[PDB]
From a paper:
Thousands of outer-arm dyneins (OADs) are arrayed in the axoneme to drive a rhythmic ciliary beat. Each OAD is divided into two regions, a head that contains AAA+ rings (rings) for ATP hydrolysis and a tail that holds together the whole complex. The tail is permanently attached to the MTD A-tubule, while the head region of each HC contains a microtubule-binding domain (MTBD), which binds and releases the MTD B-tubule depending on the nucleotide states. We reconstituted the purified OADs onto MTDs to mimic native arrays and determined the structures, by cryo-EM, of free OAD and OAD arrays bound to MTDs (OAD-MTD) in two different microtubule-binding states.
However, the inter-PF angles (defined as the relative rotation between two adjacent protofilaments) vary substantially among all pairs of MTD protofilaments. We compared the inter-PF angles from our OAD-PF reconstruction with that of the native MTD protofilaments B5–B8. The overall patterns strikingly match each other (a drop of inter-PF angle in B6–B7 and an increase in B7–B8), implying a preferred inter-PF pattern for binding the three MTBDs together.
Author numbering:
A (entry chain A): 1 to 440
B (entry chain B): 1 to 430
Write the structure that this text describes.
Amino acid sequence: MREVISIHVGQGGIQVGNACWELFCLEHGIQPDGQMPSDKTIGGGDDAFNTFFSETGAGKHVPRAVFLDLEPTVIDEVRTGTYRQLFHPEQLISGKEDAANNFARGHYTIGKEIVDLCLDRIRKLADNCTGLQGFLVFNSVGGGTGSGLGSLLLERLSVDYGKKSKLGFTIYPSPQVSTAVVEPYNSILSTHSLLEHTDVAVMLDNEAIYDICRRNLDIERPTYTNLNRLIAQVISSLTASLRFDGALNVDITEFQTNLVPYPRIHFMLSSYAPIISAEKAYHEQLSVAEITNSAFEPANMMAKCDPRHGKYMACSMMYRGDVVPKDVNASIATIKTKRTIQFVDWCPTGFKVGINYQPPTVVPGGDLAKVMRAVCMISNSTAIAEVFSRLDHKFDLMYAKRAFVHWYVGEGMEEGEFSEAREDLAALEKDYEEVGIETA
Amino acid sequence: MREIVHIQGGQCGNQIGAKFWEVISDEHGIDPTGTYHGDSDLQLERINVYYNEATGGRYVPRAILMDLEPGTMDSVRAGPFGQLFRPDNFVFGQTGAGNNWAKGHYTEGAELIDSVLDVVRKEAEGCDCLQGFQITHSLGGGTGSGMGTLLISKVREEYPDRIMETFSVVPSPKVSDTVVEPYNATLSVHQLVENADECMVIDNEALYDICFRTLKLTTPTYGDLNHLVSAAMSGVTCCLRFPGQLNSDLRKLAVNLIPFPRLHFFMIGFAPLTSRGSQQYRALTVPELTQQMFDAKNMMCAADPRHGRYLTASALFRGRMSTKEVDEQMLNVQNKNSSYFVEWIPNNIKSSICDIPPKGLKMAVTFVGNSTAIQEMFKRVAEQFTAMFRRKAFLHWYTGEGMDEMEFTEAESNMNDLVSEYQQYQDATA
Ligand SMILES: Nc1nc2c(ncn2[C@@H]2O[C@H](COP(=O)(O)OP(=O)(O)OP(=O)(O)O)[C@@H](O)[C@H]2O)c(=O)[nH]1
Ligand SMILES: Nc1nc2c(ncn2[C@@H]2O[C@H](COP(=O)(O)OP(=O)(O)O)[C@@H](O)[C@H]2O)c(=O)[nH]1
Ligand SMILES: [Mg+2]
């Protein structure tokens, strides 16, 4: 019944998990205890929570989630949070010591012990669900746990599970404003595994989200919480169809059908158009035309790469709330008319459109205006080759110096994997450049 | 989970350790009797990382105090919180090295190493998941330096993968309390480079500088120096004891600051230090903390980094703050002084955040940067050792202990090679 097993790796992943799960509980009005309170007793509004939650049969709805980490700190802060009783304790897996940004350490030494318990919990949650769409996996491809454990988990999911899905939400190392020195190596190896084992990899860069926040929300001092809540809004809009009825319904499986044209090229930017201060929306009309135009402004991309340098290969717009199909068609027409926006020739029809009646909720405490119309665009564009070449350049610097390779080699990782992944990335950017050209 | 075994050896070692345990207790609100007195339950979520539990809820520091001058036992017992440590951990000789490295590394240290090895082994096996040991000592003295490097070699042979971090107090030609400081420092670092995971150097003259310029203290005593180094040391492992937004344990700092295994020397610093006079003037905010903790004066080493170039650097911020602010400050200082940072490293700064500040404080940073200026601070000791070794002064003191001149030759050559390595990776370009 449209079930979606969620996965979360690493500290970033688990913080995003907290965010998205607070958001979901607020959406379905599930009190922190886990008991959905009946409202007006006019009929049980079932079929809604079931996408993400699962009823234990006694009025307790537990989330179909699994949290994975090798450091017991953040997972315990989850345990000592407003949602302590909310999660079935088995799913909040933890390890004694962490990989410490050492992708290899988490990939061979530490992970290969907790991956078994995680796979067990996953098979459990799957045996529960009937008609599962696929798995969402949020992870920081910069950190050791995130990257490494995510690679291992995705490989195990690929081999053990059928064509269901694998949606990946990666917090890529921001191009300009980095946080760790070893980010290049972990990011590159994570990518080399990801491109093989993931269906869809929507990219996310904290730098771009910082810029979006200060530009629109005017929160000059954002924290990771605001970023988390923005990403939560995003993935909510991504699965709104699986829960709320609308004019057109886009199941998660349809992205991997539409957006990704070739098995290797499956990286995608994302954008969320109406993002306005509660006190600023007083001045905005928020027409669907305005939404659609703003969603294509390269500034509002959730990742940081300008598609004006690239080409839009495919786009998926998903609208929520007071949406009318006539205006949506008009807006996509006008956008196709624009010159700043260019589509590849061989893809003439570059749009998957979804329209869901459910207006996006507002979370108390997050600075976002109530709004009746929203969109989220997942776009596979050629400009992501820019960020990939950027990481290639940084990684090439470090590795031509052979800077930190000893750390990884100490973890039984054969150093040949480095050059192998770098050559794979060279081939990938070559693929992007190739498909960027028109036909002969 | 991720336990720590503190190891202090030597007079300066014992003073540093005593002040350190005082500060860590003030951080956990533990009263010198041994019980808890705080108010935030968080203060107990990670309390096992440094203390073991004893019967009656009394928490006992997982410390191991060792020395060769038995008077230091009386010394540590004298100060407050001297009641904390369990006397079983106390290990002491009777003779004392007397500033002699060999005496504390061959003749006498070899006779206490067995006992302290038993003690550290018991403390380790008692703990389940050991992050590693945080040893602290001074290289100027004999017992500290010699016994410290001996036991460090031993424990490294016994626990290779665990972190073996060391706060070493290298003597400076500025203060030059003793005269055999060159031989001690040389014969210490020669093994330090071979066994230590990561090393923070601390120079008394640098601490005096900080206590005279940054702080304006009419009478800086060794107590105040120990206080500063304690504040630093606590700030190092802060993320291990408190949740924060982006965690960073010791191993994370290690991997993020060690390009090559022989370059494991950093220069620490503490951000919000301000004199009681200028305290009300300079407002407390993240850019101020950056400007300070990156001042060439504010470093706890005597090496001016301006001459050098930061290979990598890290910072740990205590207290709730905006991740965008700190990360933007990092990027800013990166793009501001690009000459001061190696080019082949894309982003040489590692940032971390814990949202629990030091008591009575709002925000505070603990900077740890691997530079090449340290190569200068080692050139100092190298030329000092060369001078006082050409004519073979005081050499008989060491040779009578079973040590031979070949040891001095190999030690000074190893230090020279380390210096050349740092020099190359400074001048190297990409
Ligand atoms: N968007 C977002 N990213 C985060 C957040 N917290 C951490 N990150 C990302 O996580 C990276 C830090 O590494 P970690 O997430 O700690 O790596 P890990 O998988 O959690 O485990 P370790 O590698 O052992 O640290 C940084 O690059 C951040 O970009 C968060 O709250 N929100
Ligand atoms: N920073 C600092 N240095 C100290 C302190 N006490 C002693 N020292 C230094 O330690 C050196 C002497 O150490 P010593 O007593 O011989 O240690 P030992 O080798 O274990 O006996 C001197 O150069 C002092 O400068 C202190 O409280 N703080
Ligand atoms: Mg992490």
